[PDB]
């Protein structure tokens, strides 16, 4: 109630520095093709050729990128390719955005700092998927009371679980006021140890 973690800026211009969600977000891998040799460090993948397909975290490919593609170029995973961008248009209420994740909107908004050609078509997928999956999170979260919700929440990602936990915290708080139950003073964080 007073532990206010630093929130995630993974949807705006640039992720926050201290947010433990973005730190684990950017760690996810991404495919690149190198433009030069990689001397003195070919141990991991001593030198590495130019024109080689490698898998690197996102944070690494932040500074190793330039406009001229001096060191390496990037190509998007298939989840954001043209293939799946039609699937997410058929009916977005069917996809398991936890397997295709578990950071869909967080990752996809950082792949816009690579000035690829099809950006005007990724920032339209996300917008049209989130709008598609809305009337199923506005209604399965404000209307699921004293139920086992661990199956209404099995196909969501970190940007959506944060909302499914705000619908419930406002349902279970009006239903606790209606029953004269939110008058008793209780232990706040000690019942967490118990």
């Amino acid at each position: 109630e007073a532990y206010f973690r630093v929130e995630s800026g993974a949807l705006g211009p640039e992720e926050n520095f201290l947010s433990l969600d973005d730190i684990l977000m950017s760690h996810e891998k991404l495919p690149v093709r190198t433009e030069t040799a990689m001397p003195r460090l070919g141990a991991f993948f001593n030198a590495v050729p130019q024109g080689s397909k490698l898998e690197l975290p996102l944070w690494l490919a932040k500074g190793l990128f330039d406009n001229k593609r001096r060191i390496l170029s990037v190509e998007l995973p298939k989840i954001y390719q043209e293939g799946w961008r039609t699937v997410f248009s058929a009916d977005p209420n069917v996809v398991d955005l936890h397997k295709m994740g578990p950071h869909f909107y967080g990752f996809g908004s950082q792949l816009l700092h690579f000035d690829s050609p099809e950006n005007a078509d990724i920032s339209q997928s996300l917008l049209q998927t989130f709008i598609g999956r809305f009337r199923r999170i506005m209604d399965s979260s404000q209307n699921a009371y004293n139920e086992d919700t661990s199956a209404l929440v099995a196909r969501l990602d970190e940007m959506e679980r944060g909302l499914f936990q705000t619908g419930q915290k406002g349902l279970n708080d009006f239903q606790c006021w209606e029953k004269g139950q939110a008058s008793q003073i209780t232990a706040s964080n000690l019942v967490q140890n118990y």
């Binding site: 009337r135 399965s140 209307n143 699921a144 009371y145 209606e178 029953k179 004269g180 139950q181």
Partner: protein, 144 residues
Amino acid sequence: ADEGQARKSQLQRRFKEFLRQYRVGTDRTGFTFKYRDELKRHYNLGEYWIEVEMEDLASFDEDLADYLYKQPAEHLQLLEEAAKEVADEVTRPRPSGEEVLQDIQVMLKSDASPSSIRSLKSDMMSHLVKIPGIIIAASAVRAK
């Protein structure tokens, strides 16, 4: 014949005032409308079924919960046609994609002592029974 529908239009009105009025909880703590809220919370999720309890129906209006034990066939219909007229005045206006009112399968449970298969004498023909057992088979779903 003409008194038939005139009784029904007076039962389908007393089965509707039960869902619309039955509460629980005391006066010290606070109350809770038990079946309107479940109708709404099951409709908005897209489930279309409530679970009426026979003790409640008995304690509200004593005659209805007796008809329901004697003539369950022709009274479950009135119950399920009042559940549909209450689920209409509770969830409306439905937002955009649905505007046709669905049909509410009213199940019902109870807390009463169970009979047994060996105690199904023919005088129990068309009376609510309550038997325990063990499922042994299962057909494949079909249309009807």
